[PDB]
Amino acid sequence: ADDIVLKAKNGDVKFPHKAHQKAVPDCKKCHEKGPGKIEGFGKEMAHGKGCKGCHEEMKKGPTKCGECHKK
Ligand code: HEC
Ligand code: HEC
Numbered sequence: 082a083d084d085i086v087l088k089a090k091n092g093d094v095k096f097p098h099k100a101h102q103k104a105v106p107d108c109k110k111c112h113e114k115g116p117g118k119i120e121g122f123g124k125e126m127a128h129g130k131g132c133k134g135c136h137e138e139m140k141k142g143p144t145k146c147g148e149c150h151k152k
């Protein structure tokens with residue numbers, strides 16, 4: 082519903098999808114062409130190239146934990 086809560090054992094993550102729906106070439110960057118559950122999105126993938134990794138390269142976004150993780 083615009084905001085996708087990623088229940089975490091170490092603080093939840095408030096990620097605005099409807100918001101992230103843009104700022105991307107033409108979507109299909111994360112999904113890889115196809116909606117639905119993104120494979121077995123693991124905790125490693127998050128910090129990988131499917132959450133942070135992006136920003137790390139996108140040069141846009143927060144990389145801090147408190148930025149992603151919040152109580
Ligand atoms: C920045 C990466 C990214 C982009 C770009 C993106 N999404 Fe998502 N999308 C996600 C993530 C992360 C989830 C949550 C997957 C999970 O939690 O299992 C998700 C979940 C979804 C879901 C599952 C239910 C829901 O409503 O969230 C749908 C449907 C979806 N995306 C559609 C799209 C479509 C269609 C596009 C563009 C054509 C798009 N998304 C663009 C990251 C992205
Ligand atoms: C395709 C690369 C990409 C991926 C993957 C991606 N994002 Fe972003 N992120 C961006 C872009 C682009 C912006 C810039 C948004 C702006 O300009 O306001 C951004 C900005 C943000 C911001 C700052 C704006 C805000 O809403 O507070 C947060 C927080 C954020 N991302 C969290 C996440 C989280 C959490 C995930 C993983 C579920 C994620 N992002 C996955 C591209 C990505």
Ligand code: HEC
Binds near residue numbers: 090123124144145
């Ligand atoms: C760009 C957003 C983002 C940033 C920055 C980030 N994380 Fe994460 N982290 C996530 C997401 C998303 C998950 C998975 C949550 C889910 O989907 O259940 C996660 C999961 C985790 C998990 C495992 C989840 C569990 O099962 O408890 C740990 C540990 C973790 N993060 C530690 C950190 C630490 C430490 C930092 C800072 C040094 C950090 N994270 C910063 C997005 C981020």
